[PDB]
Amino acid sequence: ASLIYRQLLTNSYTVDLSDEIQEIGSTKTQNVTINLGPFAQTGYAPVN
Amino acid sequence: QNYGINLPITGSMDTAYANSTQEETFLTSTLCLYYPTEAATEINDNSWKDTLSQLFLTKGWPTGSVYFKEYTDIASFSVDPQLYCDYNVVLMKYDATLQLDMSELADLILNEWLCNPMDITLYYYQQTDEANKWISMGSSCTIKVCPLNTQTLGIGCLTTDTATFEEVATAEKLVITDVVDGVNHKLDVTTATCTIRNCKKLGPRENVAVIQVGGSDVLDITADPTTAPQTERMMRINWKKWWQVFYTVVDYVNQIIQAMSKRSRSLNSAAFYYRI
Amino acid sequence: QNYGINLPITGSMDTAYANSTQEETFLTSTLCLYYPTEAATEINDNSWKDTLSQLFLTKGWPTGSVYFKEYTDIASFSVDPQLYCDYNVVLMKYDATLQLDMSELADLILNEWLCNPMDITLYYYQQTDEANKWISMGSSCTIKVCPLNTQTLGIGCLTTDTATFEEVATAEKLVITDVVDGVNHKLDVTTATCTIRNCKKLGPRENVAVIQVGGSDVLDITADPTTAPQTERMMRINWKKWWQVFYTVVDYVNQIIQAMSKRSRSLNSAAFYYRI
Amino acid sequence: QNYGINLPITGSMDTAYANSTQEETFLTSTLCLYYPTEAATEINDNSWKDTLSQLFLTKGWPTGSVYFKEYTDIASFSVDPQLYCDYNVVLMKYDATLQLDMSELADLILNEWLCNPMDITLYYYQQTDEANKWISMGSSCTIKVCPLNTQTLGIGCLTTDTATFEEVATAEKLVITDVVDGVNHKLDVTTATCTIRNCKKLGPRENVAVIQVGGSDVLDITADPTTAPQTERMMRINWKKWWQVFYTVVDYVNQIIQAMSKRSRSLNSAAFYYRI
Amino acid sequence: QNYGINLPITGSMDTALTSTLCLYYPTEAATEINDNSWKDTLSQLFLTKGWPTGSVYFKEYTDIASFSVDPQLYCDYNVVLMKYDATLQLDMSELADLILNEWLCNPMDITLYYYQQTDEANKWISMGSSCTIKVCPLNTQTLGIGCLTTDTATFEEVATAEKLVITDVVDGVNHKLDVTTATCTIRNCKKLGPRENVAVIQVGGSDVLDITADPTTAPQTERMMRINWKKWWQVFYTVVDYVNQIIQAMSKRSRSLNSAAFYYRI
Ligand SMILES: *[C@@H]1O[C@H](CO)[C@@H](O)[C@H](O)[C@H]1NC(C)=O
Ligand SMILES: *[C@@H]1O[C@H](CO)[C@@H](O)[C@H](O)[C@H]1NC(C)=O
Ligand SMILES: *[C@@H]1O[C@H](CO)[C@@H](O)[C@H](O)[C@H]1NC(C)=O
Ligand SMILES: [Ca+2]
Ligand SMILES: [Ca+2]
Ligand SMILES: [Ca+2]
Ligand SMILES: [Ca+2]
Ligand SMILES: [Ca+2]
Ligand SMILES: [Ca+2]
Ligand SMILES: [Ca+2]
Ligand SMILES: [Ca+2]
Ligand SMILES: [Ca+2]
Ligand SMILES: [Ca+2]
Ligand SMILES: [Ca+2]
Ligand SMILES: [Ca+2]
Ligand SMILES: [Ca+2]
Ligand SMILES: [Ca+2]
Numbered sequence A: 001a002s003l004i005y006r007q008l009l010t011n012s013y014t015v016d017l018s019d020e021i022q023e024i025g026s027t028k029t030q031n032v033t034i035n036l037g038p039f040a041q042t043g044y045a046p047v048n
Numbered sequence B, C, D: 001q002n003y004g005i006n007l008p009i010t011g012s013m014d015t016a017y018a019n020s021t022q023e024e025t026f027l028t029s030t031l032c033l034y035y036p037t038e039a040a041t042e043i044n045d046n047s048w049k050d051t052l053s054q055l056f057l058t059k060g061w062p063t064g065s066v067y068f069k070e071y072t073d074i075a076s077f078s079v080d081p082q083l084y085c086d087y088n089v090v091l092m093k094y095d096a097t098l099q100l101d102m103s104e105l106a107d108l109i110l111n112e113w114l115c116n117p118m119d120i121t122l123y124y125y126q127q128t129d130e131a132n133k134w135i136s137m138g139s140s141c142t143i144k145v146c147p148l149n150t151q152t153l154g155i156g157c158l159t160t161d162t163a164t165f166e167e168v169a170t171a172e173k174l175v176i177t178d179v180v181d182g183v184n185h186k187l188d189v190t191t192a193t194c195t196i197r198n199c200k201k202l203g204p205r206e207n208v209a210v211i212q213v214g215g216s217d218v219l220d221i222t223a224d225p226t227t228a229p230q231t232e233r234m235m236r237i238n239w240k241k242w243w244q245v246f247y248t249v250v251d252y253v254n255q256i257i258q259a260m261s262k263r264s265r266s267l268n269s270a271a272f273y274y275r276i
Numbered sequence E: 001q002n003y004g005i006n007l008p009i010t011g012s013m014d015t016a017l018t019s020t021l022c023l024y025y026p027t028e029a030a031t032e033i034n035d036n037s038w039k040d041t042l043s044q045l046f047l048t049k050g051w052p053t054g055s056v057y058f059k060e061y062t063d064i065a066s067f068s069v070d071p072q073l074y075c076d077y078n079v080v081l082m083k084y085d086a087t088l089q090l091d092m093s094e095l096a097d098l099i100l101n102e103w104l105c106n107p108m109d110i111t112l113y114y115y116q117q118t119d120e121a122n123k124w125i126s127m128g129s130s131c132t133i134k135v136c137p138l139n140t141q142t143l144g145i146g147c148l149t150t151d152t153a154t155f156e157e158v159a160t161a162e163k164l165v166i167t168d169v170v171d172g173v174n175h176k177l178d179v180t181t182a183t184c185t186i187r188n189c190k191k192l193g194p195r196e197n198v199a200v201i202q203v204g205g206s207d208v209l210d211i212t213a214d215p216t217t218a219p220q221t222e223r224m225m226r227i228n229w230k231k232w233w234q235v236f237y238t239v240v241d242y243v244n245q246i247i248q249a250m251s252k253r254s255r256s257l258n259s260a261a262f263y264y265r266i
């Protein structure tokens, strides 16, 4: 009855395929580059 | 499981070396980096923390295990250095005019201190042995001392008149005071602004290392004039840019952690001795 | 020690008793007495501390070993309690309204805790086991809880809308939250004036004793409803004058200390062990 | 004769020592003395070369073998420092603000470096091990680095915009850059006026000694923070007059050469390993 | 090593930084290619042959004359693509003589000292913007032969406006030397042996190289290749495709610490 384990590990390559299938219908959410940093403090020129 | 009692441990001189545990310790331990504000100012980036975290990930430290703590300067940092990570690395910029202060900071965070309260104006205080010091910390610590003789009369000072007290510290954020042992002293301290504690130097603190950025070997963490031990946890680097300093810290993190050890006083084994 | 912590200690059942170490304990120890402000106000003496120190000296303690710390009230004292001396006796006044707060303070200071930070804004937190609680301390700690389900959706609450959260603490100086174990929660806490930590109760803190002045046995240092253990370190007395209370504390200091075990004093004075 | 293979050599204890070879090496070797211009300026004697040559002859060296090479200062001398004599001695004046530059110069000349060219415009570069550095020299070498993740995207920077690059060197005449190992970096170097090379530290360069004239122990010829070795070839001298400095160098030339050895990479026996 | 250099190596007959490549090509090659990304293409084509990304390096030189001014050999393997010009034959040979062999050179102060060449391995190599070497052989009495030691106009000229020149004079004879020391420098060099990590591929022409001063021998070593060409792209493709064979002719065990073409000793 140990074969199950040996099979579970042996056939585990097919897991990849399943993931691909589960990724087929999954929605895609792609991120963009985000500015951070020393953002200089700029204001209005002397105004009267 | 047999906490609070010391037992001898017997081992053989032919037990095989176990495999490296560096990967496991990196995986299951935290690292804190203390740097001055001017380091962040010079770096002139805000994602630099994430960049260093990723670079550490390349060195095996899991994301989020490395912590970056900031302090304004040595004087402000010395008020109450509270180091909580498993491994603490403190980047300390060198300034000649602050030499002693730097030493004091190192003396405070490279060693373990058992500190009891001090109530001046109600008890006179002796320093029993070499390891006994008086650590004063606060916004501004001004400590004046009046040694007394066996009859409780001051030596070169009047118990009533504080103006005659010998002045040993002026407006200090942190000061380690060492007086002559076996002599009672009356203390005048700015209690409203500073707190003074009677501390015993138990031994080294192995999870804290100090990297001195620039300068020469000036740290002196032992009050004894005849010893100036540069331990393996006290490092020195020359610098011109802080990015190079941080890259050096990241790349050689293996060596830095090797120089350090887990806090012996902490962790479950040292339970019912002092802590945990 | 650590290399002999997990080793057996064998002793024979005929070893002669050693002499009384009470004198040696008093000589090499320090005592901290925590009392409320009303005690000092009622005493209305500027030398009562010196009188108590002299009486303790009559009881064997060296002169500069007994220290006295004053707190405004139970709620004020519960914000980051600090236990300084080797032996810490806390004179806690009884109020029928502050019963839960008295119990929380006693639980915090009569037990050793291992706490970690919680970033409530980023992660959903759960309590692993019966020893795991959330200890919140600050000027005003208002904790609201939203339990979730396997799909991360809230039950009886909406993660987006905090107004639907199940408030469990409001305007608290110290609170020990116990939620259902194994359930992820999303927490709203006034982080500006509150700090919440995930804490595990390691065990008793045997160097801290609490004397309840007035009332009945109301302390409950166990979150478990089925048990309300009264330990040897939970004393209770009846009072009319604070001077009599202090005289009872001084006279029976032998018994009070005998109910406490030394070596439980952490290197730090905090009421919990902070780990990152 | 067998030049390509490393054959073991079996020596026998008790083999009689050979006579002193100091005279023979002095007669059949050349000594180069590198000093700053200010040295000659202070000395103010157009014939001092002849005087030093005659003094060296009194010490053993034939009067055609001691060479005196003059450099303006540390910064200028660091650009392609070419040392061709059998024994090179460099008097380096100490400046408290040029510690890193002095350390870089010593690291470059006190150690053997195997350098390959670098095309920052063509390849992304990575440092393989701790012995690998990026040594750049020129009139004004400014180096900025952008680490890249496994997907080749920059970390904390954009490969397209060099403004986001992390600056590691600015207007450096010489700089030894050490970045995190195993990470590819896009390099932005002012190649128009400086050359960058990818180098390995093979080992010590035994025919170059550096005397730091009037400073402290500050040289760090190793990028590892945990090591700041003081090899026998780095000496320190206090000074007020350069004539005294040169007299000390002449009088202790025996010891100075003793601290040095013939360049291992040089000479015939090093053939077919790297050079000659 | 050095303590086991003079020891035998016994072997049985019955028993059975990574490498870097430098390509030296003339600038006219890159001009003919006319592409600004050809280096990347050649790097990937080399990577097909097993050279990692940042291993191959391409160094440009204006021409044979300019390249000869103190040439520098940077990589583990140095394949030099040299365009053939019937008018520059000797110069090409000189470059090969200075590039395919290891030299040991000492400073020469022509103004103060006479110089002689001890043996057949001794030459005088001079390099710079422009060399004009004029030689006056002397006799046992130190008087010039066909020349006047004081009058340099009678000196025999052996080089004129040379960017590189290897001078071979009669051995055992002292020579007074007039060299344009301002614009170029001369050194007494000794040929130690082959430099196995440098190969020279002559693009076009015929076999004309002569890396030995002896007139009786003109050996073509395995590191001296020749290829006919019409398009530089074909030249670079054949260099890339047969890089295995090119490296086979070379040995990685001649890369000195410095890139100079000669060891220098004071
Ligand atoms: C064993 O040691 C090797 C060599 O350092 C290391 O790669 C490996 O991670 C270690 N652990 C195990 C479980 O093999
Ligand atoms: C213990 O008590 C006994 C009885 O008074 C006394 O004789 C002895 O000296 C004491 N001390 C020790 C160390 O046994
Ligand atoms: C070495 O020195 C000794 C004693 O000065 C002398 O007798 C001998 O000839 C010298 N030379 C050799 C090769 O031993
Ligand atoms: Ca100080
Ligand atoms: Ca006085
Ligand atoms: Ca003392
Ligand atoms: Ca000391
Ligand atoms: Ca409460
Ligand atoms: Ca609700
Ligand atoms: Ca719970
Ligand atoms: Ca209970
Ligand atoms: Ca520099
Ligand atoms: Ca950036
Ligand atoms: Ca590196
Ligand atoms: Ca170092
Ligand atoms: Ca020529
Ligand atoms: Ca003539």
Ligand SMILES: [Ca+2]
Binding pocket: E117, E119, E120, E122, E168, E169, E170, E171
């Ligand atoms: Ca000849």
Ligand SMILES: [Ca+2]
Binding pocket: E210, E211, E212, E213, E214, E215, E216, E217, E218
């Ligand atoms: Ca020939």
